[PDB]
Design a protein around this ligand. Structure first.
Ligand SMILES: O=c1ccn([C@H]2C[C@H](O)[C@@H](COP(=O)(O)O)O2)c(=O)[nH]1
Ligand SMILES: O=c1ccn([C@H]2C[C@H](O)[C@@H](COP(=O)(O)O)O2)c(=O)[nH]1
Lengths: 287, 288
């Protein structure tokens, strides 16, 4: 069976078994607590096909995390605006960060992945080698002790949370090796099934590919674990239409040269091949 | 309805049937699956395994010891619970490069992370009053004030403190959730020894869920157990196979015997397990 069926099955489960739950945004959701799906990474890449995923956003965001950037502008300049509202003058001021430059998200993913526990100053500070470089640690451990059961990168940092523009959804991930295959499990505390989760599966599948490449291993599985898995009330009808679509076989991800360290990957090193997502169809709602 | 213990028993079977041989830190070797998830209802029952006795006394005294912030193995040892004693021993501490540490001093393990995340650890006797993040009370305050919140997390995985810990935490984080007046908890356990650890760990986090449900005026919902490396040690295969032949009987009940207002105020005598009479733990003899 096609891996995307697992996603569709989760969407169906929430539509059928989920409870209505109010949320932070005021939008409302149908929600289930606790879900898990497994996406093979073997000779295919799980970029969902029943609705186009913003792959450009996935890849530039991840390269921004890796370089340790906490500057929304450094992502925005690549045409990816996902962090912009959280770095805006008015949003930063709303949190009491009037001293910050526009774009300064505080100690979010890039900073935690590369400098966990360092004292955050501003997004322009030199953190060269302060704090824990979890990303490099994970990579070193996979190479030296691939049986290790502690190969973890954690972005959830309770001491730092109040300085972040928003709290991390991807609380931690763990890697694992057996049979020359590298697998990753993501603990995602909160998943927008219609709009966030497909991008999220692609982000951590890519990270797996990148690390497998550096460490000389084959991608195995990406296990996706959710806390509050929810469908926003506004996405219920679109996802009903989507659930009726037959997934197309997943694309392949190609890495276009031999890359030796995680810091050396660049956007042009990657190719998604054979990505055939369903075209959108117009749907009307009326009262 | 299908008994909740069947979730655990099915995981053990799945590992035995579909797990890969995987070498490990101890040198024993394991059968291993990466990524599993079970759900244990906590509604009118308490998931203490009936097919093999679980060390309940240990579960309860250990949790109370976490809640009070203790990182001293001796404080738990005096309760007759020796589970952390070897990791606080002179010899073990010295092996880790902690020759100056007092016997019993585990470093900034769960107790410390749950009550004081981010404080600078000195030793087990230091006053950390008002230092770091008290994530345990913050969880409880959030459940009370904004139960819909999607960030109710307590995290013991602290990369900065890891090198000071006697051992790295297996229960990396947990998350709480509220719906329909019911409190649920999900545990992300990075490594589970299905034979020896997991039964105990299910009970600890189901117990934590009952305590917090009690303080917050909610009914226990589900405990969702998520595993990273779910493994059976090669020396536990034959015992587990015996255990798998055992029919599950009804899980017991947990009663809390008084009205407790804050988490720090729970005491051992506040708890009663009713209707627990498990099969004995499994011992096998072989002439080799
Ligand atoms: O990578 C991401 C980031 C956010 N969200 C969704 C989950 C929630 O719908 C919302 C975050 O709001 P809270 O969980 O913080 O309330 O964004 C995702 O699905 N994936
Ligand atoms: O609460 C606990 C603590 C430990 N373990 C098991 C998992 C591993 O078998 C071993 C820990 O070793 P590492 O995962 O750290 O190698 O103990 C548990 O199951 N539960």
């Amino acid at each position: 069976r096609h891996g995307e069926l697992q996603y569709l099955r989760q969407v169906e489960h929430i539509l059928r078994c989920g409870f209505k739950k109010e949320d932070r945004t005021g939008t409302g959701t149908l929600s289930v607590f606790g879900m898990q799906a497994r996406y093979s990474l073997r000779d295919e890449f799980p970029l969902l096909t029943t609705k186009r995923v913003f792959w450009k956003g996935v890849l530039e965001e991840l390269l921004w995390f890796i370089k340790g950037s906490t500057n929304a502008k450094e992502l925005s300049s690549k045409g990816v605006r996902i962090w912009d509202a959280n770095g805006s003058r008015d949003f930063l001021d709303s949190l009491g960060f009037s001293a910050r430059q526009e774009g300064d998200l505080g100690p979010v993913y890039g900073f935690q992945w590369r400098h966990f526990g360092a004292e955050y100053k501003d997004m322009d500070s030199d953190y060269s080698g302060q704090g824990v470089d979890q990303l490099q640690k994970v990579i070193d451990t996979i190479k030296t002790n691939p049986d290790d059961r502690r190969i973890i990168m954690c972005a959830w940092n309770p001491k730092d949370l109040p300085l972040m523009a928003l709290p991390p959804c991807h609380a931690l991930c763990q890697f694992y090796v057996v049979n020359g295959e590298l697998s990753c499990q993501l603990y995602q505390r909160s998943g927008d099934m219609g709009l966030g989760v497909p991008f999220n599966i692609a982000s951590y599948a890519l990270l797996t590919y990148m690390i497998a490449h550096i460490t000389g291993l084959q991608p195995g599985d990406f296990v996706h674990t959710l806390g509050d898995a929810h469908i926003y009330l506004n996405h219920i009808e679109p996802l009903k239409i989507q659930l009726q679509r037959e997934p197309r076989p997943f694309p392949k991800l190609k890495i276009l040269r031999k890359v030796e360290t995680i810091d050396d990957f660049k956007v042009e090193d990657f190719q998604i091949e054979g990505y055939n997502p369903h075209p959108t169809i117009k749907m009307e709602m009326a009262v």
